[PDB]
């Protein structure tokens, strides 16, 4: 009879709180949250889908900080990040919308730089510097959902965030000058700007 949605909110907010102290792994928690929010919604991922599991402001801030210093974030950890961040742009917080929380957070620009300058830092095997089509599409839907959610409220902050992204990539010791990072994701970001 009682809805189990608020208990799931409490325990997932707890897990996102213990993300900072290395108590829980990031990529498995993101996969679990995405799987539950996708099935409860039927199975297929859609950008026009509100998650059933609601995360607080401190959970998103801890997630962005953990991403802001996560060493050698793998590429499909990054795709889990992009799909999850799209779903938190769909997510309502109980004020300020969560897309405004994402763009207003200073860690998101470092997240985007670390994605666009990731390349293959381990270099264990010979790999292409491009990220493939799926990561490019996921980044495109994430930026599109940011644009849609902040067109009415404040598009100037999103435009300034995009310009700061291009500025940080385009300076000296950057991804644009050194040639590192995906070409496809940077080209799609340029087309979106």
């Amino acid at each position: 009879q009682l809805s189990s949605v608020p208990m799931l909110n409490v325990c997932f907010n707890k897990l996102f709180s213990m993300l900072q102290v290395h108590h829980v792994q990031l990529e498995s928690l993101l996969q679990l949250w995405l799987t539950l929010s996708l099935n409860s919604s039927i199975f297929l991922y859609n950008a026009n889908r509100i998650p059933v599991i609601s995360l607080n402001q401190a959970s998103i801030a801890s997630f962005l900080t953990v991403l802001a210093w996560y060493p050698n974030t793998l590429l499909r950890t990054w795709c889990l990040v992009l799909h999850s961040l799209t779903l938190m742009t769909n997510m309502q917080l109980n004020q300020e919308t969560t897309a405004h929380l994402l763009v207003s957070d200073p860690n998101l620009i470092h997240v985007l730089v670390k994605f666009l300058s990731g390349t293959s830092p381990h270099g264990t095997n010979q790999h292409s510097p491009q990220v493939g089509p799926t990561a490019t599409q996921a980044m495109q839907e994430f930026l599109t959902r940011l644009q849609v959610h902040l067109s009415s409220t404040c598009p100037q902050i999103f435009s300034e965030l995009l310009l700061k992204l291009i500025h940080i990539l385009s300076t000296e010791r950057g991804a644009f000058q050194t040639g590192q990072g995906p070409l496809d994701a940077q080209v799609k970001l340029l087309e979106f700007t």
């Binding site: 102290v21 290395h22 108590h23 996969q31 799987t35 996708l38 199975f43 297929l44 991922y45 060493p71 050698n72 793998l74 590429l75 499909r76 795709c79 889990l80 293959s120 830092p121 381990h122 270099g123 264990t124 095997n125 010979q126 790999h127 292409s128 491009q130 990220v131 493939g132 089509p133 799926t134």
Partner: protein, 904 residues
């Protein structure tokens, strides 16, 4: 690496060591999920580790600001820095055994060499021990208060063994408290880890039904409408070489850069390797880069890694470091770099399913066994520090339950006998620990806390109570036979367990912790009986007749009478009764008082024989005249077809009773006595050589052949008497069926002798990886030290020593009590040895040959003639000519002639 660093500043060396250590730890901890194989950055990291190895060997100057111009070393400052040592120990922890097994081309060998050089160049031993203790205490990221332990890999385990090799390192390890921390980390990791053994679920699924391709079961789809269906790519048959035509060809539009191939497996399987075969005739059509998308749900593709460059490869093999479930696999293939067409020969998805015949074809890190490997090394490396390590491991809660669960788990990296040694020394440290270990093995095997609500306390639920294996038999036997103070309390606990099991069986019969008393192991009861027999034989200091109780003997008698005769548990209780009759001669007289002998059934006769296997009970049974009464009444029943009536159903239990009591040598001499001599010819007259029904006749036939074979077994005057009886039978037309039964099985089958081996070194070849209940006599004992083999007399001693142990240089040498201090040759057989022993003090027809195996006139023993077979004595008496007369691709004329010359 070629340069030498002499007067370089210390701060530069420390910065280099810290930065390279962090870089190598970042390289090892962060690796791609997809590995693909067709100078290297592994060589770069290994040369960096070689540079750190050179830098830690540098001597240090007195001012310590700069290195020595040319005691103090740079390795001391490496040991002082906690971050560098934590990163090195963690980086060796994430390394598997596959990288280290090259022992030095990989980075794990570089970390091992750096750590070994740090151990060698340490100023004091405690300076090397302190980061190790910090890494054990910290866990994963310094976390405490939860079910978190640091991951111990096999290379890291080997490094800690090489650190704790020296005696001062072990003493400093106890001074730091590392033994308690190892035990607590063992308990918490055993609580945290669930076993991945295949268990009994996979057995039922295997009956109800190294990596296999699942591409033919799947269906391949492409989102491009112009693409071919590509179903030939999923075929299991590989395309032939130089086919000159692509199996599937895709035409690329100029705007299109990626082509997708999507394979939907019918069920989700574990996926390990993906093999893509390009067109061999033209590698221009080979894809430039391939990325792999997998999906556990099958509709939402979460891919694996970055796109792998596949240009100029005849075969694309994509291998996952981590096997992941995938019900659907999608493959995005890039446009070729030069050609505009995509040529694929075959696509293979290699993996394993769960729950089937396809579910078939590092353990230190997965399980909690490496902590007990360290505990075993600390206990058994040096005997002087052994007691003080065992006193260190004593106050740890739930250690014995964890060690027993690791003992009877499947093999997870370390063999069961060393687990047994750890359990023996922990139980032998104190009397309370010994009684606790006896309680765990027999009555209650569960955690002392036993709190499922707490969810962080250890719990040992899931292990069956009172469960037996050969390991626990060895634990109980070594606890019983050890003559340390507190032994009497352990024997009292064993006898209390036996008494409580008998009372629980009585209450089960009445129909009114508890599971161990409800189900006793027959092997455990036989082990208790063997402990009692060998402690009575050893003349122990504690009074073993005082520990035995008359009411316990009565309870065991009623429990043995209640069980059916075919039950193994009745044989175990009868072995306990035999041990108590051996220790107490009055117990056997009280037993015959219960029998009423001054109405016998089959369980009565079985209990009488098994309790009368002991020689004092042999003497008392011979003095009571019970086998005399049975032999006269049996001869009367034979003549029919003080006297006692014998029913026809009772006859074969009487013969079985006579066989089992005639296992002994005194009653072997008694069956050659003048009273029993009419019985053999009377049995031959009873069976009539073709009244009794057919099934009764067949059963009494088998029992008569077994009885005569037990009578004549390596007893030369008995087989001489049997030859006299048989030649008198043959002298008095054609060969009957039971006569041929007797001749073949009694006469032409070679005689087999029971043989008992005693070795101080434990023998492990005969033991297997299952539980079994083989009830034997309590003089033979139990455990890996004692072996019993039932072998023919033609078998050599070399085959015996090969059967008891592999022994692939110290050599095991066979020894005998009569042959004191004289080695036995491997070339002789058991028959020549029996001839020698019958020449010496050992009586004819002994129960078992006693051989002593100790690790390191023989030709005169080889010249000794073997024991004559019953065939040899029978043909020496001349009955072979008699059976030649009575008898009615080898040629048949050879056989007919051979019979005619057997007449001669």
């Amino acid at each position: 690496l070629e340069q030498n660093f002499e007067v370089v500043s210390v701060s530069t060396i420390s910065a280099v060591i810290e930065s390279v250590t962090f870089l190598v730890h970042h390289y090892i901890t962060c690796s791609d999920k997809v590995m693909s194989r067709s100078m290297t950055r592994d060589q770069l990291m290994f040369d960096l580790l070689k540079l750190v190895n050179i830098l830690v060997q540098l001597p240090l100057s007195s001012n310590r600001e700069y290195s020595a111009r040319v005691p103090a070393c740079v390795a001391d400052l490496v040991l002082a820095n906690q971050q560098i040592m934590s990163q090195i120990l963690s980086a060796l922890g994430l390394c598997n055994s596959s990288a280290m097994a090259m022992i030095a081309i990989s980075v794990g060998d570089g970390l091992f060499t750096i750590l070994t050089t740090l151990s060698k160049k340490a100023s004091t031993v405690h300076m090397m021990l302190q980061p190790i203790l910090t890494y054990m205490a910290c866990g994963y990221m310094g976390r405490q208060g939860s079910l978190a332990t640091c991951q111990l890999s096999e290379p890291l385990l080997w490094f800690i063994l090489r650190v704790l090799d020296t005696s001062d390192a072990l003493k400093a390890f106890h001074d730091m408290g590392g033994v308690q921390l190892i035990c607590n980390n063992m308990v918490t990791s055993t609580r945290a880890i669930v076993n991945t053994a295949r268990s009994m679920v996979s057995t039922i699924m295997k009956f109800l039904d190294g990596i296999h391709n699942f591409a033919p079961l799947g269906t391949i789809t492409s989102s491009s409408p112009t693409a071919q269906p590509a179903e030939v790519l999923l075929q299991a048959t590989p395309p032939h070489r130089r086919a000159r035509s692509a199996a599937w060809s895709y035409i690329f539009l100029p705007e299109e850069a990626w082509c997708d191939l999507t394979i939907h497996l019918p069920s989700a399987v574990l996926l390990k390797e993906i093999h893509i075969q390009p067109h061999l005739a033209s590698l221009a059509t080979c894809p430039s880069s391939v990325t792999v998308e997998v999906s556990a749900d099958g509709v939402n593709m979460l891919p694996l890694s970055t796109p792998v460059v596949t240009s100029g490869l005849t075969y694309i093999k994509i291998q996952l470091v981590k096997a992941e479930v995938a019900s659907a696999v999608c493959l995005r293939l890039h446009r070729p770099r030069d050609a505009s067409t995509l040529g694929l020969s075959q696509i293979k998805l290699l993996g394993l399913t769960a729950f089937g015949t396809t579910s078939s074809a590092d353990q230190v890190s997965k399980t909690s066994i490496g902590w007990l490997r360290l505990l075993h090394h600390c206990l058994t490396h040096i005997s002087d520090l052994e007691g003080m390590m065992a006193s260190a491991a004593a106050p740890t809660a739930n250690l014995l339950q964890t060690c027993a669960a690791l003992l009877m788990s499947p093999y997870c990296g370390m063999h069961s006998p060393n687990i047994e040694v750890v359990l023996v020394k922990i139980g032998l440290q104190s009397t309370r620990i010994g009684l606790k270990l006896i309680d765990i093995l027999l009555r209650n095997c569960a955690a002392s806390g036993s709190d499922p609500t707490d969810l962080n306390s250890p719990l040992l639920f899931g292990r069956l109570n009172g469960l037996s294996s050969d390991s626990t038999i060895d634990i109980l036997y070594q606890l019983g036979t050890t003559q340390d103070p507190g032994t009497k309390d352990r024997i009292q606990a064993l006898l209390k367990w036996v008494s409580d099991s008998a009372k629980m069986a009585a209450l089960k019969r009445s129909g009114r912790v508890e599971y161990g008393l409800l189900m006793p192991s027959p092997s455990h009861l036989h082990c208790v009986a063997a402990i009692l027999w060998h402690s009575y034989e050893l003349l122990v200091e504690y009074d073993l007749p005082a520990l035995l109780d008359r009411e316990l003997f009565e309870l065991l008698f009623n429990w043995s009478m209640s069980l059916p005769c075919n039950v193994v548990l009745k044989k175990a209780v009868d072995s306990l009764l035999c041990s108590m009759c051996h220790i107490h001669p009055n117990y056997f007289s009280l037993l015959m008082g219960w029998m009423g002998i001054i109405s016998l059934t089959e369980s009565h006769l079985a209990t009488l024989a098994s309790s009368s296997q002991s020689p004092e009970a042999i003497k008392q049974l011979l003095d009571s005249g019970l086998p005399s009464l049975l032999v006269r009444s049996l001869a009367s029943f034979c003549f029919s077809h003080n006297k006692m009536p014998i029913t026809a159903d009772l006859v074969a239990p009487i013969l079985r009773f006579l066989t089992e009591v005639g296992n002994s040598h005194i009653m072997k001499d008694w069956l050659g006595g003048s009273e029993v001599n009419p019985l053999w010819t009377a049995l031959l007259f009873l069976l009539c050589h073709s009244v009794l029904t057919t099934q009764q006749r067949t059963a009494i036939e088998n029992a008569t052949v077994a009885f005569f074979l037990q009578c004549i077994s390596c007893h030369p005057n008995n087989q001489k008497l049997m030859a006299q009886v048989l030649c008198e039978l043959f002298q008095t037309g054609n060969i009957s069926g039971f006569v041929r039964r007797l001749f073949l099985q009694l006469m032409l089958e070679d005689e087999k002798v029971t043989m008992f081996l005693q070795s101080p070194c434990p023998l492990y070849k005969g033991r297997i990886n299952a539980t079994s209940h083989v009830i034997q006599h309590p003089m033979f004992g139990a455990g890996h030290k004692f072996r019993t083999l039932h072998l023919p007399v033609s078998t050599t001693l070399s085959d015996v020593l090969d059967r008891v142990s592999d022994t692939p240089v110290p050599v095991f040498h066979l020894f005998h009590r009569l042959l004191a201090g004289q080695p036995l040759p491997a070339e002789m057989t058991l028959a020549q040895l029996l001839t020698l022993l019958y020449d010496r003090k050992l009586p004819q027809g002994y129960r078992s040959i006693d051989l002593t195996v100790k690790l390191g006139l023989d030709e005169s023993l080889l010249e000794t003639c073997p024991i004559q077979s019953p065939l040899q004595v029978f043909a020496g008496m001349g009955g072979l000519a008699l059976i030649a007369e009575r008898l009615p691709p080898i040629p048949a004329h050879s056989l007919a002639a051979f019979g005619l010359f057997l007449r001669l």
